[PDB]
Amino acid sequence: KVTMNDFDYLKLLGKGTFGKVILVREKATGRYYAMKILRKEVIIAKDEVAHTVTESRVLQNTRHPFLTALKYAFQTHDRLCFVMEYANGGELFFHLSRERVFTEERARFYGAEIVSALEYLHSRDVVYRDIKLENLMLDKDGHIKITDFGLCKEGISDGATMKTFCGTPEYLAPEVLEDNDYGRAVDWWGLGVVMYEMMCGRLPFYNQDHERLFELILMEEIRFPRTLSPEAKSLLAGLLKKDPKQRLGGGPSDAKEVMEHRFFLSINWQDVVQKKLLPPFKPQVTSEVDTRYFDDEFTAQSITQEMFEDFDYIADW
Template sequence: GEHIKNWRKRYFILRDDGSLIGFKVQPEPGQYADPLNNFTVKDCQVMRQDRPRAFTFIIRGLQWAQVIERMFCVDTHDEREKWVAAIEYVDRNLRQDIEMAEEASTLEQQNLRDKFNLSTRKNSSSKITLDNFEFLKVLGKGTFGKVVLCREKASAHLYAIKVLKKQVVIAKDEVAHTLTENRVLQTISHPFIIALKYSFQDAHRLFFVIEYVNGGELFFHLSRERVFGEEKTRFYGAEILLALEYLHAQGIIYRDLKLENLLLDREGHIKIADFGLCKEDIIYGRTTRTFCGTPEYLAPEVLDDTDYGRAVDWWGLGVVMYEMVCGRLPFYNRDHDVLFELILADEVRFPPGLGPDACNLLTGLLTKEPSKRLGGSERDAQDIKEHAFFCRIHWDQLLTRQLTPPFIPQVTSDTDTRYFDQEFTGESVELTPPDYHGTEGPTFGLNSISEEVEQPYFQQFSYHGTTSLVGSAGSAVAAVETPLTTEAPAKGERCMVDEHDPSSGSE
């Protein structure tokens, strides 16, 4: 039949149940109830072609008893390849029978899901408890509790569980920060930010079930190498920049950027962790006043006890990039009063041999006045991305993890914990109940703490993974959920694209 000449912009989301749903603009996270288009990729055939436009692909499949072809177009070859690979991956999974799916390599499945950042949709009403997990190794310990490597029994996927003692959280006035971290992690999704799978509680503790990455902290690797060099610093700095850009677009400032909160995954990409100090509802022009952070990384405006905004994160980026490329902090003194004076008044100095672009970038990021700081304008991250230091970065490829990291962690398996402190990994994974004074009581098995007793502080704490878990690309919810141009099909075909939608416009 005669083809419709106009193309309509649509924002499509591919689910791993095979549904391909389209919206006029990017929907809010979780607001997927009323799509303009609702297709399926189950039992489909995907064909590439470069007509009538470049980077076109066609999805051919059955609707009712009729073969339907739907034509899509994206902006680049890489985008098309990403979409085709993701669609074929989902279709292949749907074709497998239950037995084959159970026998499939869980590692391969997780790696593919991470690679394509597929949005998942769960409809689980069952209660998550410790009984759902097998605890394997202690990864770390702190004031509030510990982090334990675990395996989810139902899926065999590995996760890290952060275990916080309620009494300590309450006693140290960390309830608000803990709830903020839980709330924020439920709503964000980015390839360079650690992902939350579940959160739940029992009588004594709070549990965050988060994405497990075993490449180690940047702090660990920099301590070994002393200095990263400009190329490695450029790569890590760019990935951190994209994560902060995404957070700022969501109205969130991070406020706790430091090497200890920057992890590497198995492939060598950045994952930002620990969202306890982040602040919501901070867009350009809005400010907050809370004094918080790590002393060596505090921005001058925080120390001045004045209102501050999202430019604090660009100061933090400047500090961690300075550490990477120079091998030391830009300002340091053991006496915090002296340290704070240095941050407020001292000029940043650079070692000989550091390139002019690196010096210029760090000078811009470490500018005392936030309004004059690189990234401090309404353009936010865009000003930093356009700096000469980053001129060789292909931002789209970086965001979709297509660029090879400068260092690949030398891990032999998913349970290889060589980059974690051996002081912790050799400890028992058993949990101990806190007594009324906040100290540890007699040891007993994990499964004996299974009853969830909610306290007034934590009534809304539990989260069972009902929204997208992983990654995003640019302003998209997930890497495969990018704006996609679609051509309406031939007249007379049964399709949910509205051929006469007057508000859809044409290109």
């Protein structure tokens, strides 16, 4: 069994309604983790129970270098706690806010890792449903890790459908803004939006008014910069095709149509997963406790029976 007091609470990485995320150090081992700490009473009050429970079930039945790994899940009387591996490199949202726009080659590196992951997830009958720069993190070695699995759907294989209107407004596939059900293609739309942010330096469609933002995703055609490579333009036009059946990775082969596009001609898909590629960017951290790739906003602060049945957890690794 494991308890809140097996951990040293070192730095605050995030904070919101549902709780905090803290860099912590397991006292008995020395090894550093990110701990997601959530108030049970706020989770229950805002109908986010299933999501939390899905997140733990998903995180429990997944094994992949580009998906974040759960070491410990536990609860106290008023809290739920996930102890997952620490992403030293911060969010892509952080890096891309700084650089503004990545090179095609770098975009391509990250794009491959996301694709390999969505491949894995789709092979497990999971549809991720929340691809965004915020959910994409970088480990110590410079590799992507998907964080946050609350919005996933499970047991969707081949052409199974889903109904829940969910995810992130800016990142929503057109078919999810149409009434009725939708398939796993939505993940590829998602990839299309992040690759575009990485390459064209802005969101493909944006309006603070959500009514307009949806009129945009449904009706408007993406523009591309003039000197963006033709194979990049091709990839993006394919992933941001509005009709899912005509979208790249929207056919019966799924991730394979995306792997066999000529944007990725130089990528060896056997050796992406095996991690034989020197990443194009190494986070530049001095100590283990350095949080220069998270916001001063959070890091500068110092620190303090039915429903949750399938939650507690201890990893064998």
